[PDB]
Design a protein around this nucleic acid. Structure first.
Length: 98
RNA sequence: CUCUCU
């Protein structure tokens, strides 16, 4: 289906193409001016990420900002959309408890 | 490098 693209979405955005060894400190310092960012995630083995945010309007402005700014991945555009999900969580595996 | 799957 077509459900990859948003139309009335929520607070997690997703990023592709990511740098060779980019860090959370950079990604959150790029989401901080917008609301608070509640979180991020790193699909780092595919060079992809999520960026989850504390307010729907912050993230609407954050994605529209990234549709405006493009912050340039050292010599190419940066590839953003709202997520296939709502509300990111990042807790540890069942093994750690055991 | 389009979604937390390999």
């Amino acid at each position: 289906g077509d459900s990859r693209s948003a139309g009335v979405p929520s607070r997690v955005i997703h990023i592709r193409k990511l740098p060779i060894d980019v860090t959370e400190g950079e990604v959150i310092s790029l989401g901080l001016p917008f609301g608070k960012v509640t979180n991020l995630l790193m699909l780092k083995g595919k060079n992809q990420a999520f960026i989850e945010m504390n307010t729907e309007e912050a993230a609407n402005t954050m994605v529209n900002y990234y549709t405006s700014v493009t912050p340039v991945l050292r010599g190419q555009p940066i590839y953003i959309q709202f997520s296939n999900h709502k509300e990111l969580k990042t807790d540890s595996s069942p093994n750690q408890a055991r």
